[PDB]
Amino acid sequence: XXXXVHQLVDIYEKYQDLYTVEPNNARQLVEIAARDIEKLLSNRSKALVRLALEAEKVQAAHQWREDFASNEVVYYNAKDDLDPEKNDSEPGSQRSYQHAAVHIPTDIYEGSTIVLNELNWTSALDDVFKKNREEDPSLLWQVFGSATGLARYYPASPWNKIDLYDVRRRPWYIQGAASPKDMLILVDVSGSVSGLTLKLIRTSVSEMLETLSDDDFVNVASFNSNAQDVSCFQHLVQANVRNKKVLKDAVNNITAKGITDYKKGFSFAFEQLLNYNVSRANCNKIIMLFTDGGEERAQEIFAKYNKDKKVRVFTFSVGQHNYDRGPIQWMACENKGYYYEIPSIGAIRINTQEYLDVLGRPMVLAGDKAKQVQWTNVYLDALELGLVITGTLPVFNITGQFENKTNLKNQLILGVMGVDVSLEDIKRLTPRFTLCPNGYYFAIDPNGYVLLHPNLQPKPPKSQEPVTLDFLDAELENDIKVEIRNKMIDGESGEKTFRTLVKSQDERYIDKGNRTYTWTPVNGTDYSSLALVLPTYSFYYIKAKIEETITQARYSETLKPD
Amino acid sequence: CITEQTQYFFDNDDCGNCSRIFHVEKLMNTNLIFIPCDTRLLIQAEQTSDGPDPCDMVKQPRYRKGPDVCFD
């Protein structure tokens, strides 16, 4: 009993007069918990399937006739309630059970041929079967996400703060359309853009990288009179936090200065895109020009380095200027790629609008058996709830360019509910297929870059997520342990386990010791369950049973009432 | 300070150990702890890279009908 000393031994003697439990199978604890998680993920995956199979149908027969005006949806249901999963369900219709909430982008207006037309067929069947999915508690937050408006099942109330929140932008949805992405930006810093469109473009990259997937490699190829890169030269995997921040703040200083080499930037663009030496993460291979307007075709380099057309071009003319869209509009179409503009601060929705869907083309095609659920990295809910993983799936149109991406919220709280904490008293930890776990080694805040107290003078844009983390940084480095995370990150090894004698951080001063610990890959989708253990043994005393004298000790608890 | 000089000799004879925490009040605070107190935050960037990434799935990109819809 540690410091409790010899007087405590009598309790063990009383325990000698009593009962225990021991147990703690370690290995089997891992196998079981992993499999259990597999069971949850299976239930909710199968549940997810239903929206595919069903939303495909109604959309196929939605008629999509205009007219409208009459009865859709409409009004505003309002039935108060309060229960588990927090939040008092009550009133929810910008346009448990009881009807369904239907969020809209605050800029998008509930007054269009498109909007209501969706609004019909979506809820018109979704409500039913999602409710059927409520027949099997407890779906924590079933959520539909379309091109615009949310469908939240059950009436959690949306929402002087401004709701700048969208859905096209919000990452789980980004995961649901075309993955992964090899990205190579070319800002045109050419002594040509003013400081105006420079500010705009600066903001543009500044947000787009946030818009960009948080597991896709990226550079920033500034060019004019010469090509050049912001320092890194490898790119990136992205800690999102640190890496993207570096690149971003580097963007923060990007003065225009110099004539347009144009081709030379491209010359490195394909090349820096080319490479082969490590990382890279092979897949779609695309570059993004943000520029005032090109003065030439560059087909020469194109044929020089592309014909497999694995290269893509997304060109984003911005602001006003006056330069012809021609050579640019020639280019993206020339090379598979979808050009489109950002005139002012329409930057948010325009960024998402075809940054993903144009990459959705292959998925629309042969992709269909690919509609396996695509789980996300941990992040905080838009509504207060605490951090929650969200499994997504795509849903197809009928002949067109893809419909919309359904998902399920999964409280990491109940993810922990499958994570027993009683046979032991130190830590679980569950690293993702790359960065992060959900390990009880940390709490609930959005990481953050480095420092910077904001200048109070200008201030009279609120949380962005995900909480990305190194396994390596979540907990103390040991090289050997680094071998271990680099082993598990591939996911290859199964029951492989061993102690590493190691100092361990606690509150604010470190201990040291051995920690034999179990872990396995999930048999299903990636990940890896894990169980760090104070090599103290592997047992957990308990007690059973009967009232009687134990009821008398319960009466001692009755004495403990006061 | 001078006590930290005696401590410096104590180090010559314990465990100076930087230990970043990305959490805390937003900022990425470093924490020395010995086997004096939490300060601000800095540094990373790196030159040498490590920690192998992985995927090896889907990555659909091959096509047979990229319609030249372009824009507009």
Read out DSSP for A430-474? ---SSS----TT--SS----S-----TTT------------HHHH
Tokens of A65: 């006739």
Distance of alpha carbon A243 from alpha carbon A240, whole angstroms: 6
Distance of alpha carbon A160 from alpha carbon A125, whole angstroms: 34
Distance of alpha carbon A355 from alpha carbon A177, whole angstroms: 10
CA-nearest of A198, A192, A260 to A224 is A260
Residues A359, A416 contacting (CB under 8 angstroms): no
Tokens of A402: 């893809």
Look-up of token digits 């059927």: A132
Q: Please state the separation of Cα A510 from the chain's center in Å.
A: 33
Half-sphere exposure of A473 (CA within 13 A, CB side): 21
Resolution of this deposited model, Å: 4.2
Q: Is the dihedral of CA A247, A253, A254, A258 positive or negative?
A: negative
- Is A192 known as a binding-site position? yes
Cα distances from A307 to residues A1, A311, A335, A498, in angstroms, run 72, 9, 9, 50
DSSP reduced 3-state for A169: coil
What is the per-residue DSSP string for A465-481? ------HHHHS---SHH
Element (H, E) at A239: none
Look-up of token digits 């543009």: A204
Residues 6+ apart with CB under 8 A from A107: A349
Quickly count helices (H) and strands (E) in chain B. Answer: 1, 0
- Please tell me if residue B26 touches chain A, with a CB cutoff of 8 Å: yes
Q: Please state the separation of Cα A480 from the chain's center in Å.
A: 29
Residues A427, A168 contacting (CB under 8 angstroms): no
CA-nearest of A287, A325, A291, A317 to A193 is A291
DSSP A2: G
Cα distances from A259 to residues A188, A320, A555, in angstroms, run 10, 20, 87
Strand partners, A130: none
What ranges make up the beta strands (E) of A170-234? 182-187, 218-223, 227-229
Residues 6+ apart with CB under 8 A from A384: A86, A87
CA-nearest of A310, A197, A209 to A256 is A197
Distance of alpha carbon A405 from alpha carbon A152, whole angstroms: 13
Please give the backbone phi and psi of residue A511, each rounded to the nearest 5 degrees, phi first: -105, -165
CB-nearest partner of B23 from A278, A442, A486: A442
Single-letter amino acid code for the residue at B24: V
DSSP A30: H
Answer whether B63 sits within 8 Å of A361, measured CB to CB: yes
Cα distances from A411 to residues A36, A386, A389, in angstroms, run 15, 8, 7
DSSP reduced 3-state for A20: coil
Residues A258, A190 contacting (CB under 8 angstroms): yes
Tokens of A107: 């800029």
Residues B23, A445 contacting (CB under 8 angstroms): yes
Single-letter amino acid code for the residue at A290: F
Residues of B in contact with A433 (CB under 8 A): 54
Distance of alpha carbon A205 from alpha carbon A185, whole angstroms: 9
Q: In what order do the strands lie in the sheet with A528-532?
A: A427-428, A528-532, A517-521
Residues A180, A284 contacting (CB under 8 angstroms): yes
Put simply, the chain A residues between 436 and 465 with a CB less than 8 A from any chain B CB are 442-443, 445-451
Residues of A in contact with B51 (CB under 8 A): 237, 470, 472, 482, 485-486, 489
Q: Please state the separation of Cα A271 from the chain's center in Å.
A: 30
- Please tell me if residue A552 touches chain B, with a CB cutoff of 8 Å: no
DSSP reduced 3-state for B71: coil
DSSP reduced 3-state for A326: helix
CA-nearest of A164, A215, A177 to A355 is A177
Q: Please state the separation of Cα A188 from the chain's center in Å.
A: 30
Answer whether A434 sits within 8 Å of B54, measured CB to CB: yes
Distance of alpha carbon A247 from alpha carbon A242, whole angstroms: 9
Tokens of A516: 């034999």
Q: Is A101 exposed, middle or buried (CB count within 10 Å of its CB: 0-12, 13-18, 19+)?
A: buried
